[PDB]
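Q: What changes when zinc ion is included in the input?
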Amino acid sequence: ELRVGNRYRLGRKIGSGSFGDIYLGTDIAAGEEVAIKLECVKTKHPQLHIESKIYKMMQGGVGIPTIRWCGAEGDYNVMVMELLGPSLEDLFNFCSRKFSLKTVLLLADQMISRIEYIHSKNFIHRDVKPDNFLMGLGKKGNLVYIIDFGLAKKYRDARTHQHIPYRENKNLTGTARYASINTHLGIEQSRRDDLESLGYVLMYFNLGSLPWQGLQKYERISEKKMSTPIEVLCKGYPSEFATYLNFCRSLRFDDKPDYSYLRQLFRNLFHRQGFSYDYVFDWNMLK
Ligand SMILES: [Zn+2]
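A: The predicted holo structure follows.
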């Protein structure tokens, strides 16, 4: 019967984050479920308040979760957030690990816009992956949320817009599976790299798997990733997936991406395919 001070009662683990897990909670005053993150005050490098600050900086963005509370309570730093629905990875497993083209296109449109909004607030995410996208609840069930800013970094000064310097010899941050080729090569991440990851995530949803899945290990993924041409990766799928990836890989370090061009590629394909823009996802057509 664990209680976060007076206000919240703790429940089962419901998520795994870059720094700590997410637990199911109840807000005692609301009669309401919430998501809770905990960090021991003795932690060597505390980051919970740091990550909460980014969220709050993003607040009011479409598809950004809201923070109910951040503070110290007892021997913990605590972060309480609005509870969201299943991740795209979860829903992918319920859909037999294959999404229809219509689902992938509806998802791409939202996912490019979340990344675009984050970049507009001067941050890069750096762990773009299916588990960090969650569907909303109730009336927001048709909205894709982006979560987890623990690996997120500022890429430009807010007032001056001075972009962070080019560096190399970096250790990989984020999941090796969706990492950009330049990330595997040790280059400092930038805007281009969040968009390149998203492309691997979209092809993952079309294919059910990537060619560098299921094979020292990091050199081996990097090899296979660098050995597999985009044309080969995207064979049998609309040309827009390859075009998306080619453009991302063309981008120079500090370049601003053309988010509208990438979204339009997919919107045009959507028109040609004859799909209704009805936000009816593959999982909604499940029993
Ligand atoms: Zn705080």
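Observations recorded in class: Residues 49, 52, 70-71 surround zinc ion (CB under 6 Å).
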